[PDB]
Symmetry: C3
Subunit: 240 residues, 3 copies
């Protein structure tokens, strides 16, 4: 691979590894809002989802780094077949988002995201013009899923803001809004990147697409999980 590609892969792998190790340490050392439960997150494993996500992401990028130094394909599921790592991760991200917010249809939303990602995987491994049909079907399903998840997220954000008066509550709400903006705005770029890649309109080269994918992953995973975590720890739920 090119110098830029290998450098971006190494930087992304190191960033996600550091983020995974910090998140795991914070989760293990977290003692709950009361500061008395030794294994608060042990009996509430959903709070660990973020951590696992990062770990998986890190592993994927690790494979990429190996593929960056060898002429032969590395771990095919995480390097060869596109969007499989996303198939594994994004549903967990949606489940965590709708769990911290106590939103309805968390499992349904996660399954919809997984189905959209599998449709995208089929589209990326298809041949035109059938690839166009697969992309159109995925686009309709993702539009429906996006509208549904926004409607739930907006209604939970309004509910949370209605009963948030403490300064710490306001700071946690700002972090939650930042995480929500990262989740919604950034996710819309992935379809734009696919439609702008060598597939369909070929304008952006492979290297720039890969670097943009790496940057979007790093942001929307590391910063997203950190913000979610700031919000979960520093937002009193009993204010409901």
């Amino acid at each position: 691979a090119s110098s830029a590609v290998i450098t971006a892969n190494w930087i992304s792998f190191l960033a996600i590894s550091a983020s995974f190790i910090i998140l795991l340490v914070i989760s293990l050392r977290y003692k709950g809002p009361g500061g008395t439960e030794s294994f608060y997150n042990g009996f509430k494993e959903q709070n660990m989802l973020t951590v696992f996500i990062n770990l998986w992401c890190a592993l994927a990028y690790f494979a990429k780094v190996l593929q960056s130094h060898s002429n032969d394909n590395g771990f095919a599921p995480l390097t060869v077949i596109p969007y499989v790592d996303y198939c594994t991760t994004c549903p967990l991200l949606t489940l965590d988002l709708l769990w911290c917010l106590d939103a309805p249809y968390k499992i349904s939303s996660a399954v919809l995201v997984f189905t959209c990602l599998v449709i995208a995987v089929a589209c990326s491994l298809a041949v035109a013009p059938f690839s166009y049909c697969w992309f159109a079907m995925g686009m309709v399903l993702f539009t429906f899923t996006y509208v549904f998840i926004l409607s739930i997220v907006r209604q939970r954000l309004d509910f949370f803001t209605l009963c948030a008066r403490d300064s710490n509550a306001k700071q946690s709400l700002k972090h939650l809004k930042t995480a929500v903006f990262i989740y919604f705005g950034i996710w819309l770029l992935f379809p734009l990147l696919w439609l702008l890649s060598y597939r369909a309109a070929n304008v952006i080269s492979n290297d720039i697409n890969h670097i943009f994918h790496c940057i979007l992953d790093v942001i929307a995973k590391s910063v997203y999980g950190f913000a979610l975590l700031y919000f979960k720890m520093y937002f009193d739920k009993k204010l409901i």
Copy 2:
């Protein structure tokens, strides 16, 4: 493919898509027995299983439609490898059946169905005479699973009928019996179709086998889910 095959694929895809969209609309608009919960199914995601099943089925058939118009294989998992779509769907159907009935060993029954379907997948990709051994092992496992699930279903049906006196309760019980008959009688045809296909006794041609599979899927998914849904909404549980 032949005109009959493509016509059957299109009809099945349209029927399952319409069934998925109607079931999703009904589930989203359903407000619970009391008619006061805005997200009754949101906090009870098992009631959405049916919907997801149909959606997945629809997607599978969509792939078939694409494979029906191209000389190259489409989405291999849903078109090339047989029974993989069934591997994904049937365990969910069993889980939903044993959940609406509040039956024991729902997860165990789903795992048994998944194991039987994986054994069938191995059998379909094997070479004789090892295919015969795989089929025999799958037949013993499926016989055990069928006897166990019938025994649970019959005992829950007797329990439900013991305390069902309302006219609406009787109508819901009739729909539940129709769904149970569809689940049990129709499922016995799939092994008969496999034993009658080009594998083992080659009497029925590929096209007729495909059309019969499409009809059985459409019935035992669309009508089955509609009946289950009639039963879940229009059967007061508090009569226990």
Copy 3:
């Protein structure tokens, strides 16, 4: 295959099949500590995990037996790709271990074991020297997971021993300690077997590695599940 390989495969398959059928019969006939619940394990499906594990293991070995009598590869997922059967089974074993002990991070520990096994699968299908890097990463992850799971297991064993005074309680504690020793000591042999196989230091031939793998599987599944089961049935929890 050689006479020794086929004999070991047949013996392992028969042992695991007999163990699965005895465990399933005991679980179905078990009526709970009170001896009044007809479906005690039906509403507590975690107690069935062991059974399912054995069944899956049995199926895997069945495939091996077929591969032992044909020049062509059998069910590739359970015979060709190494550690995939382990990917399916070991996480369930860890989940069951941490569930019977009411240990924290049971799902987290299961996901860590699954990630370690997937890393091992990637390592076994890699090419040197990238295989060495994959093995090193898997070794660090497994060391962390081993230390974490030991720390949880030791703390739950101390907790259980603190309030175990009955003779039957002592007998169940002895069986639990035997199961824990099987889980910890035996698992350390698998990495030693991999490091001693044709990969890395080639000293032990393939046949001896296969026989050792079969013996370790048989012990650490059949005897492990039987001990876990002796402990779950014959240990009064109300003594907490």
